[PDB]
């Protein structure tokens, strides 16, 4: 009904992508005739179809858009598989509109971004082809005016990829299944604190924001790496700033919408999506948060350029990350650093990035000693409820976050491991 | 509970005061543990703030320079006595009075305009034997209600205590003059019926559209100030059509009791009201997207103001769109100088607004005379009115019904004089 949402995927196509022709798939008829109306400054060119079932006719589809179009075939591998097969021989672009709020699963939406990324397929060339994904985002109709928070846009690009050696075949799958599963997210939240990935939970999230100095209400955040959402709930109901959270774990997000939805609030929208990928709008941000998240990407040249450009002149950039100390580095580190796949910079080389991005009034202090206390703490208060951890979790999920906590400890002492803080400004 | 709530008092405190010292903040809060959110909110600015938890110790209170009511009218905002009682306190003992009050509850969805009025107009004498009151800042929603709970009708009122000029005018400050005089209840829904359901501007919704277009290219989550948003017509197109947030502002407490109630009903958080005047309101630098006004600022004397604040307000490329009653070239009737006077309307010509444009420093400047559209949408109105009036007697009164018939007759009159002009200007902040 609202013309909002189709032009909502029309913004998302003129950042992905000329245009011939447009391909609607909506059983719903009045919504799909507001995609033909939204669509006419890219192309009058756009036509719609009732069902699925008529997918297999369709041909060379520039855009091809789904509207609501999954419903009865979301919980079916099978008929999925056969959508997908469908989709990507189509489609140019591949726009997913689908609302998620009654699906059983409450967390489907994990379950749906790793099936579409994964998928690949060989086409009339015998070429290897797939959906690259660009963004999983929330239908802003839905979260301002329903307050529905599981209504998704998932954007994709189909295209051929080069060959992959790992078991993993992208890097949103790498996270997924190694680092953040389900279970070591549930095993990482007990340790650091309820709604926290990071150090020191609630408490020393809120020491740290309060870093950028004063908030006003309704000024803008982007999070990088938001993970289970803690941090981004924390600053709109502390501050009544807007949080745009972007994280590339789909089980990380689905959690934070998850809970998003059950405690609504709509100074808080969610995106699955690499941080070197989403294009944000140039000086549309009053701040750029990242709580332990940047020691997994490697280009973090490119990273701070993004940062630099999508901030607001006078605006705020603040970023806590695992780096390296000067220490020589021992062989137990270097194993952990490659299994993480951690790529790990010294607050030297952090402060020469900052200058050659145009970076001013840069701060930067090492928080080794504190990152220490909060690691003796975490791993006490592990140690003195055996009891209660054990009831919800296995021997081997506290022997690996006893270990690993006493592992990181070693590594501080070896000046290997060190948790640093950066804070800058853009230009005014 | 959320600490957002008594920040953003903090924030329209710092606004407000915004040089001068604040030594101690009293505050009265029947909830207690609310009421200690203030105490931890507020350290940034005084250490020193007190929490009472009742009206009744009020008058025991002294020399407070800032006073906050958090939901402390309650129980008593259907009488009208209690009320004064309530101000004449407030108004002795404080400097900045804040007064948080959620209306979703009163059995007057328009509650927000009865309170608005009593407390603009509320006047009383001072121990030096001045005539004291209330200085309205702005009359706000609570972000924490409208993002999430959705409740539209939980307000800050934000005002300074201050002496008054004496003055016997039947109306005493501008805001009661728009209520009371051209944006009366009955005169709104005259004038809603006339130009379009939510709309108070020439042609109504599908007019309003082809304007905004002119702004260009939308982008969803961008954001718009919209100065004179009236019933909220406008503001609504906006966020529906383009998932654009719009903030709105509109001095008229009866234009924004409409509108407040139709977004309480219709729940949009992307849409938020101020009752505030556009002189007034402090704006942050540098955070729009984009600055509306649809057919409002002939209502706003001191246009060079206006657009020095609409500039600094604009982030840099933002744009700047208004629409405006204006004056042609020719020489004034006396009708239309009679007009003119009794709306109290202040008119420029077109040279004369891109001159004050150029002058501000906006780049890009466009003007339009849209006179002749003007003149056709009239007669478009005028003849729906012509052909439908069984139906509009049967809502409305007879002199309502010439009002109309009139007022528009007259329009017409003023545009073949080449008296009154339908005004057209855009343009840009340079980056
Ligand atoms: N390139 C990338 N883009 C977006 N998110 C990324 C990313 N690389 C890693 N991340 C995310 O960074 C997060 C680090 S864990 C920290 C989560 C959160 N900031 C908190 O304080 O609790 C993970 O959720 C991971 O999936
Ligand atoms: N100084 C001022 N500040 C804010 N609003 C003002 C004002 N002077 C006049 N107005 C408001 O300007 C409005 C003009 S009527 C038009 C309303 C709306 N823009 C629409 O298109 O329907 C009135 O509601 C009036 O109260």
């Not at 309704?218 to 941090?231: E, K, N, P, Y």
Request: glycine letters at 6%; one cysteine or more.
């Amino acid at each position: 009904s609202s013309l909002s949402i189709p032009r909502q995927s029309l913004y998302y196509v003129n950042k992905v992508t000329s245009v011939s022709n447009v391909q609607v798939v909506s059983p719903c008829q009045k919504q799909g005739q507001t995609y033909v109306t939204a669509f006419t400054p890219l192309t009058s060119n756009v036509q719609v179809h009732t069902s699925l079932e008529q997918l297999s006719t369709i041909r060379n589809a520039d855009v091809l858009i789904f509207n609501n179009a999954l419903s009865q075939i979301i919980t079916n591998a099978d008929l999925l598989t056969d959508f997908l097969k469908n989709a990507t021989a189509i489609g140019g672009t591949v726009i997913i509109r689908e609302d998620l709020k009654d699906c059983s699963d409450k967390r489907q939406v994990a379950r749906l971004t790793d099936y579409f990324d994964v998928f690949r397929t060989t086409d009339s060339d015998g070429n290897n082809t797939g959906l690259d994904l660009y963004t999983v985002d929330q239908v802003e109709h839905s979260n301002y005016v329903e307050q529905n928070f599981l209504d998704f846009i998932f954007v994709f690009r189909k295209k051929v990829f080069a060959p992959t050696t790992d078991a993993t075949i992208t890097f949103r799958d790498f996270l997924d299944k190694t680092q953040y599963t389900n279970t070591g997210i549930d095993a990482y939240e007990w340790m650091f604190g309820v709604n926290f990935i990071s150090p020191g939970g609630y408490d020393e999230n809120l020491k740290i924001i309060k870093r950028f100095g004063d908030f006003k209400p309704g000024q803008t955040m982007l999070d990088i790496g938001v993970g289970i959402g803690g941090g981004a709930r924390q600053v709109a109901d502390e501050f009544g700033v807007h949080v745009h959270g972007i994280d590339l774990s789909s089980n990380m997000l689905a959690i934070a919408l998850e809970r998003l939805h059950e405690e609504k609030d709509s100074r808080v929208k969610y995106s699955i999506t690499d941080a070197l990928v989403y294009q944000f709008e140039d000086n549309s941000f009053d701040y750029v948060f990242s709580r332990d998240c940047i020691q997994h990407i490697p280009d973090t040249e490119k990273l701070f350029s993004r940062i630099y450009k999508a901030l607001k002149p006078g605006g705020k950039v603040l970023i806590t990350m695992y780096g390296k100390g000067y220490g020589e580095q021992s062989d137990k580190f270097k194993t952990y650093v490659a299994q993480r796949a951690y790529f790990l910079k010294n607050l030297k080389e952090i402060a020469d990035i900052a200058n050659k991005t145009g970076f001013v009034n840069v701060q930067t202090e090492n928080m080794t000693p504190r990152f220490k206390e909060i690691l003796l703490e975490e791993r006490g208060h592990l140690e003195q409820n055996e009891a209660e951890f054990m009831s919800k979790f296995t021997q081997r999920e506290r022997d690996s976050l006893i270990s690993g906590w006493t592992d990181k400890l070693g590594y501080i002492e070896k000046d290997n491991h060190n948790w640093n803080f950066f804070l800058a400004q853009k230009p005014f």
